[PDB]
Design an enzyme around this catalytic site. Structure first.
Site, PDB file in Angstrom:
ATOM      1  N   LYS A 186      36.208  10.791   0.540  1.00 45.54           N
ATOM      2  CA  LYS A 186      35.677  10.512   1.898  1.00 45.54           C
ATOM      3  C   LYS A 186      35.781   9.002   2.095  1.00 45.54           C
ATOM      4  O   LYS A 186      35.206   8.244   1.325  1.00 45.54           O
ATOM      5  CB  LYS A 186      34.254  11.046   2.068  1.00 45.54           C
ATOM      6  CG  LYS A 186      33.751  11.010   3.506  1.00 45.54           C
ATOM      7  CD  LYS A 186      32.321  11.471   3.696  1.00 45.54           C
ATOM      8  CE  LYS A 186      31.830  11.226   5.112  1.00 45.54           C
ATOM      9  NZ  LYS A 186      30.447  11.716   5.319  1.00 45.54           N
ATOM     10  N   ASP A 202      26.364   8.823  13.345  1.00 48.26           N
ATOM     11  CA  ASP A 202      27.386   8.392  14.323  1.00 48.26           C
ATOM     12  C   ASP A 202      27.795   6.942  14.081  1.00 48.26           C
ATOM     13  O   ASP A 202      28.991   6.651  14.187  1.00 48.26           O
ATOM     14  CB  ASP A 202      26.923   8.574  15.772  1.00 48.26           C
ATOM     15  CG  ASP A 202      28.071   8.852  16.725  1.00 48.26           C
ATOM     16  OD1 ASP A 202      28.925   9.700  16.383  1.00 48.26           O
ATOM     17  OD2 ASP A 202      28.112   8.218  17.796  1.00 48.26           O
TER      18      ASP A 202
HETATM   19  N1  V2G Z   1      27.557  14.505  18.882  1.00 49.77           N
HETATM   20  C1  V2G Z   1      27.653  15.339  17.845  1.00 49.77           C
HETATM   21  N2  V2G Z   1      26.781  16.372  17.634  1.00 49.77           N
HETATM   22  C2  V2G Z   1      26.857  17.264  16.477  1.00 49.77           C
HETATM   23  N3  V2G Z   1      27.982  16.913  15.643  1.00 49.77           N
HETATM   24  C3  V2G Z   1      28.815  15.899  15.947  1.00 49.77           C
HETATM   25  C4  V2G Z   1      28.648  15.110  17.024  1.00 49.77           C
HETATM   26  N4  V2G Z   1      29.589  14.149  17.003  1.00 49.77           N
HETATM   27  C5  V2G Z   1      30.374  14.388  15.948  1.00 49.77           C
HETATM   28  N5  V2G Z   1      29.865  15.445  15.296  1.00 49.77           N
HETATM   29  C6  V2G Z   1      30.374  16.063  14.075  1.00 49.77           C
HETATM   30  O1  V2G Z   1      30.877  15.085  13.195  1.00 49.77           O
HETATM   31  C7  V2G Z   1      31.419  15.920  12.164  1.00 49.77           C
HETATM   32  C8  V2G Z   1      32.195  15.078  11.164  1.00 49.77           C
HETATM   33  O2  V2G Z   1      31.249  14.181  10.535  1.00 49.77           O
HETATM   34  P1  V2G Z   1      29.810  14.734   9.929  1.00 49.77           P
HETATM   35  O3  V2G Z   1      29.105  15.508  10.990  1.00 49.77           O
HETATM   36  O4  V2G Z   1      30.145  15.402   8.641  1.00 49.77           O
HETATM   37  N6  V2G Z   1      28.904  13.247   9.575  1.00 49.77           N
HETATM   38  C9  V2G Z   1      27.429  13.129   9.315  1.00 49.77           C
HETATM   39  C10 V2G Z   1      26.752  14.556   9.158  1.00 49.77           C
HETATM   40  O5  V2G Z   1      26.827  15.294  10.166  1.00 49.77           O
HETATM   41  O6  V2G Z   1      26.169  14.893   8.065  1.00 49.77           O
HETATM   42  C11 V2G Z   1      32.274  16.929  12.925  1.00 49.77           C
HETATM   43  O7  V2G Z   1      32.065  18.230  12.368  1.00 49.77           O
HETATM   44  C12 V2G Z   1      31.659  16.865  14.331  1.00 49.77           C
HETATM   45  O8  V2G Z   1      31.355  18.176  14.855  1.00 49.77           O
END
Ligand code: V2G
Length: 124
Positions: free
Chosen positions: A41, A121
Protein backbone atom coordinates in the site's frame (compact mmCIF):
# COMPACT_ATOMS: atom_id res chain seq x y z
CA UNK A 1 -11.28 -6.01 7.98
CA UNK A 2 -14.86 -7.41 7.49
CA UNK A 3 -17.05 -4.32 8.15
CA UNK A 4 -16.03 -0.97 6.64
CA UNK A 5 -15.91 0.43 10.16
CA UNK A 6 -13.66 -2.44 11.33
CA UNK A 7 -11.48 -1.94 8.20
CA UNK A 8 -11.08 1.78 9.11
CA UNK A 9 -9.98 0.81 12.69
CA UNK A 10 -7.45 -1.78 11.28
CA UNK A 11 -6.05 0.57 8.59
CA UNK A 12 -6.07 3.93 10.48
CA UNK A 13 -6.42 3.69 14.30
CA UNK A 14 -3.38 3.43 16.64
CA UNK A 15 -4.32 4.75 20.13
CA UNK A 16 -3.11 1.23 21.21
CA UNK A 17 -0.13 2.97 22.92
CA UNK A 18 1.64 5.47 20.66
CA UNK A 19 1.05 9.23 21.18
CA UNK A 20 3.62 9.36 18.21
CA UNK A 21 6.10 6.69 16.68
CA UNK A 22 9.75 5.41 15.90
CA UNK A 23 11.77 5.31 12.57
CA UNK A 24 10.69 1.65 11.89
CA UNK A 25 7.02 2.32 13.01
CA UNK A 26 5.56 2.35 9.44
CA UNK A 27 7.67 -0.70 8.40
CA UNK A 28 6.19 -2.69 11.37
CA UNK A 29 2.60 -1.26 11.32
CA UNK A 30 2.03 -1.38 7.53
CA UNK A 31 2.91 -5.14 7.84
CA UNK A 32 1.12 -5.96 11.15
CA UNK A 33 -2.18 -4.27 9.97
CA UNK A 34 -2.05 -6.39 6.72
CA UNK A 35 -1.51 -3.36 4.37
CA UNK A 36 1.44 -5.22 2.68
CA UNK A 37 -0.26 -8.66 2.06
CA UNK A 38 -1.40 -8.27 -1.62
CA UNK A 39 0.93 -5.34 -2.55
CA UNK A 40 2.83 -2.48 -0.81
CA UNK A 41 0.00 0.00 0.00
CA UNK A 42 1.86 3.15 -1.20
CA UNK A 43 0.55 5.68 1.45
CA UNK A 44 -1.43 5.28 4.72
CA UNK A 45 -2.18 7.38 7.84
CA UNK A 46 -2.46 6.19 11.49
CA UNK A 47 -4.31 8.36 14.05
CA UNK A 48 -3.01 8.47 17.69
CA UNK A 49 -6.27 9.57 19.37
CA UNK A 50 -9.04 7.64 21.18
CA UNK A 51 -11.60 5.79 19.00
CA UNK A 52 -14.27 8.03 20.68
CA UNK A 53 -12.38 11.22 19.58
CA UNK A 54 -12.05 9.95 15.93
CA UNK A 55 -15.70 8.68 15.80
CA UNK A 56 -16.71 12.21 17.07
CA UNK A 57 -15.28 13.77 13.83
CA UNK A 58 -18.42 12.39 12.00
CA UNK A 59 -20.41 15.25 13.77
CA UNK A 60 -17.77 18.01 13.18
CA UNK A 61 -17.00 20.20 10.10
CA UNK A 62 -18.75 18.93 6.92
CA UNK A 63 -16.33 19.31 3.94
CA UNK A 64 -16.34 17.95 0.36
CA UNK A 65 -14.72 14.51 -0.09
CA UNK A 66 -11.90 14.09 -2.69
CA UNK A 67 -14.31 11.81 -4.67
CA UNK A 68 -17.05 14.55 -4.68
CA UNK A 69 -19.35 12.91 -2.08
CA UNK A 70 -20.62 15.16 0.77
CA UNK A 71 -20.09 12.67 3.68
CA UNK A 72 -16.60 13.97 4.76
CA UNK A 73 -15.82 15.72 8.07
CA UNK A 74 -12.79 17.70 9.25
CA UNK A 75 -11.73 17.54 12.95
CA UNK A 76 -12.10 20.92 14.77
CA UNK A 77 -8.90 20.09 16.76
CA UNK A 78 -5.50 18.96 15.41
CA UNK A 79 -4.81 15.26 16.06
CA UNK A 80 -1.53 13.33 16.43
CA UNK A 81 -1.05 11.27 13.20
CA UNK A 82 1.65 9.24 11.43
CA UNK A 83 1.93 9.35 7.58
CA UNK A 84 3.53 6.24 5.98
CA UNK A 85 4.95 6.65 2.40
CA UNK A 86 6.48 3.77 0.34
CA UNK A 87 10.24 4.47 -0.32
CA UNK A 88 11.73 4.51 -3.88
CA UNK A 89 13.75 1.30 -3.13
CA UNK A 90 10.74 -0.55 -1.53
CA UNK A 91 9.95 -3.81 -3.43
CA UNK A 92 7.14 -6.28 -2.48
CA UNK A 93 7.12 -8.36 -0.45
CA UNK A 94 9.83 -6.30 1.43
CA UNK A 95 7.66 -3.13 1.69
CA UNK A 96 9.69 -0.13 3.00
CA UNK A 97 8.18 3.15 4.35
CA UNK A 98 9.22 6.60 5.60
CA UNK A 99 7.55 7.35 9.04
CA UNK A 100 6.39 11.05 9.30
CA UNK A 101 4.77 12.19 12.61
CA UNK A 102 2.59 15.36 12.51
CA UNK A 103 -0.27 17.21 14.27
CA UNK A 104 -2.97 18.01 11.70
CA UNK A 105 -6.75 18.17 11.22
CA UNK A 106 -8.04 14.85 9.84
CA UNK A 107 -10.76 14.47 7.17
CA UNK A 108 -12.75 11.17 7.29
CA UNK A 109 -15.80 9.91 5.32
CA UNK A 110 -18.61 8.52 7.53
CA UNK A 111 -21.44 6.08 6.74
CA UNK A 112 -24.05 3.91 8.40
CA UNK A 113 -26.18 3.69 11.54
CA UNK A 114 -24.36 4.25 13.72
CA UNK A 115 -22.61 7.00 11.65
CA UNK A 116 -18.88 6.12 11.92
CA UNK A 117 -15.66 6.62 9.95
CA UNK A 118 -15.20 4.23 6.96
CA UNK A 119 -12.53 6.11 4.91
CA UNK A 120 -9.49 8.33 5.70
CA UNK A 121 -9.66 11.17 3.10
CA UNK A 122 -6.90 13.67 4.00
CA UNK A 123 -4.99 15.58 6.69
CA UNK A 124 -4.73 19.41 6.55
N1 V2G B 1 -16.67 9.61 0.51
C1 V2G B 1 -16.51 8.30 0.72
N2 V2G B 1 -17.37 7.56 1.49
C2 V2G B 1 -17.18 6.14 1.76
N3 V2G B 1 -16.00 5.65 1.08
C3 V2G B 1 -15.23 6.44 0.32
C4 V2G B 1 -15.46 7.75 0.15
N4 V2G B 1 -14.48 8.28 -0.60
C5 V2G B 1 -13.67 7.27 -0.94
N5 V2G B 1 -14.13 6.16 -0.35
C6 V2G B 1 -13.56 4.82 -0.42
O1 V2G B 1 -12.15 4.87 -0.43
C7 V2G B 1 -11.84 3.49 -0.63
C8 V2G B 1 -10.35 3.31 -0.86
O2 V2G B 1 -9.67 3.74 0.35
P1 V2G B 1 -10.16 3.19 1.84
O3 V2G B 1 -11.62 3.44 1.99
O4 V2G B 1 -9.64 1.80 1.94
N6 V2G B 1 -9.26 4.22 2.97
C9 V2G B 1 -9.53 4.40 4.44
C10 V2G B 1 -10.62 3.37 4.96
O5 V2G B 1 -11.75 3.47 4.42
O6 V2G B 1 -10.34 2.52 5.87
C11 V2G B 1 -12.71 3.09 -1.82
O7 V2G B 1 -13.29 1.80 -1.56
C12 V2G B 1 -13.80 4.16 -1.78
O8 V2G B 1 -15.13 3.59 -1.85
Amino acid sequence: KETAAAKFERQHMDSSTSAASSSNYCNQMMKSRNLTKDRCKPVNTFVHESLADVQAVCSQKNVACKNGQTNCYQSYSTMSITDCRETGSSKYPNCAYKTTQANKHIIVACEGNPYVPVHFDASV
